[PDB]
Amino acid sequence: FQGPELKVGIVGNLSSGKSALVHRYLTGTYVQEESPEGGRFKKEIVVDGQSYLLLIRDEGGPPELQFAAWVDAVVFVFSLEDEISFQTVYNYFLRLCSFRNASEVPMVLVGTQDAISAANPRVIDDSRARKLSTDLKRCTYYETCATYGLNVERVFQDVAQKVVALR
């Protein structure tokens, strides 16, 4: 008996860091190897003194009909060191909007720090990340770093809370 199901989709390209993000969230460990096929998971959570079963779906490509209809909320992911992943979030958001009313779907935007290094620095300015957030129906933006857990738990709690509020 784990509580009501909440449906959370994870959307972004293969350079985004989304497999690592979900894996840190579920296990507390950093595994870098990303999953081309994505992955479906579940995790018990507490939001406002009540238990919920969070259903996580990383579908592994652009949103399609079935995914777009299933989500309660979407976590969009790009890498702070990859322009293509950044542009892909916007495209993938537009494809969601083909199937769903965005105003009915809480969203969070995540810029991952994971792959940044001295020789491979950040490419995406915070101002541009924020402008992208306002295109995504003014959703909340977080930087994360799954190497050590920075904002990982905060991101999923945030979207869990947004979903129960709307119920």
C-alpha positions as a printed Julia matrix, in Angstrom:
167×3 Matrix{Float64}:
  0.0    0.0     0.0
  2.13   2.92   -1.38
 -0.44   5.66   -2.19
 -1.87   7.27   -5.35
  0.14   7.09   -8.58
  1.7   10.25  -10.06
  2.94  10.17  -13.65
  6.23  11.96  -14.34
  7.85  11.97  -17.74
 11.48  12.93  -18.32
 12.2   14.58  -21.68
 15.49  15.55  -23.43
 18.15  14.28  -25.83
 20.82  11.64  -25.29
 23.42  14.23  -24.22
 21.13  15.69  -21.6
 22.05  13.66  -18.51
 18.51  12.47  -17.85
 19.38   8.77  -17.26
 21.98   9.88  -14.67
 19.49  12.29  -13.1
 16.77   9.64  -12.53
 19.36   7.09  -11.4
 20.83   9.4    -8.74
 17.3   10.2    -7.63
 16.31   6.52   -7.26
 19.56   5.11   -5.79
 21.66   7.96   -4.4
 24.55   6.92   -6.69
 26.04   8.45   -9.89
 26.0    6.18  -12.94
 27.07   7.98  -16.13
 26.15   5.4   -18.78
 22.9    6.79  -20.37
 20.11   4.55  -21.67
 19.2    4.94  -25.37
 15.88   3.11  -24.72
 15.15   5.23  -21.62
 13.54   3.56  -18.61
 10.46   3.25  -16.43
 10.71   3.27  -12.7
  8.72   3.76   -9.57
  9.47   5.27   -6.17
  7.51   5.93   -3.02
  7.36   9.5    -1.94
  5.79  11.73    0.63
  4.19  15.01   -0.33
  2.44  17.07    2.4
  2.14  14.21    5.0
  0.71  11.66    2.55
  2.31   8.76    0.63
  2.37   8.7    -3.23
  3.84   6.3    -5.76
  5.81   8.25   -8.3
  5.82   6.67  -11.8
  8.88   7.88  -13.76
  9.1    7.44  -17.52
 12.12   8.33  -19.57
 10.91   7.42  -23.05
 14.25   7.86  -24.85
 13.17  10.09  -27.75
 10.77  12.91  -28.79
  7.38  12.9   -27.09
  4.77  10.91  -28.98
  0.99  10.65  -28.53
  0.91   7.89  -25.96
  3.56   9.49  -23.77
  2.11  12.97  -24.11
 -1.35  11.68  -23.03
  0.08   9.67  -20.09
  2.09  12.42  -18.31
  0.81  14.37  -15.28
  4.02  16.42  -15.37
  7.25  16.66  -17.39
 10.84  17.23  -16.3
 12.7   18.7   -19.3
 16.48  18.06  -19.24
 19.42  19.57  -21.17
 23.14  19.72  -20.52
 24.7   23.04  -19.62
 27.67  22.1   -21.83
 25.67  21.06  -24.95
 23.93  23.4   -27.35
 22.12  20.64  -29.25
 20.55  19.21  -26.03
 19.39  22.75  -25.17
 17.7   23.38  -28.58
 16.22  19.86  -28.42
 14.3   20.67  -25.22
 12.44  23.45  -26.98
 11.59  21.21  -29.98
 10.48  18.39  -27.69
  8.3   20.84  -25.73
  6.7   22.01  -28.96
  5.91  18.31  -29.8
  4.31  17.81  -26.36
  2.12  20.83  -27.15
  0.96  19.03  -30.32
 -0.79  16.48  -28.09
 -1.36  18.24  -24.74
 -2.38  21.53  -23.34
  0.84  22.74  -21.68
 -1.05  24.86  -19.14
 -2.6   21.61  -17.79
  0.85  19.9   -17.36
  3.18  21.09  -14.63
  6.79  21.34  -15.84
 10.3   21.79  -14.45
 13.4   22.64  -16.49
 16.76  21.13  -15.61
 20.21  22.19  -16.77
 22.67  19.47  -15.82
 26.24  20.31  -14.68
 27.5   16.72  -14.77
 29.68  16.81  -17.91
 31.25  20.22  -17.3
 35.06  20.17  -16.8
 38.09  22.46  -17.16
 38.56  21.42  -20.78
 34.81  21.15  -21.49
 33.2   24.29  -19.97
 29.58  25.44  -19.77
 28.11  26.7   -23.04
 24.58  27.73  -22.08
 24.21  31.11  -20.34
 21.82  31.19  -17.35
 19.91  34.02  -19.06
 19.12  31.74  -22.03
 18.13  28.89  -19.71
 15.68  31.29  -18.01
 14.31  32.57  -21.32
 13.69  28.93  -22.22
 11.89  28.47  -18.91
  9.47  31.29  -19.83
  8.75  29.65  -23.21
  7.84  26.47  -21.25
  4.82  28.21  -19.71
  7.11  29.93  -17.17
  8.18  26.7   -15.43
 10.71  26.47  -12.58
 14.38  26.08  -13.52
 17.03  24.16  -11.57
 20.71  23.36  -12.13
 21.57  19.84  -11.03
 24.69  17.76  -10.57
 24.04  14.07  -10.19
 27.79  13.37   -9.46
 26.93  14.56   -5.91
 23.11  15.02   -5.82
 22.81  18.76   -6.2
 19.07  19.68   -6.56
 18.19  16.12   -7.67
 15.75  15.41   -4.84
 14.44  19.03   -5.0
 13.48  18.6    -8.69
 11.34  15.5    -8.2
  9.7   16.72   -4.97
  8.87  19.98   -6.79
  7.04  18.19   -9.67
  5.42  15.67   -7.29
  4.01  18.63   -5.24
  2.76  20.47   -8.36
  0.88  17.27   -9.44
 -0.9   16.63   -6.07
 -1.89  20.33   -5.79
 -3.76  20.0    -9.15
 -5.61  16.87   -7.83
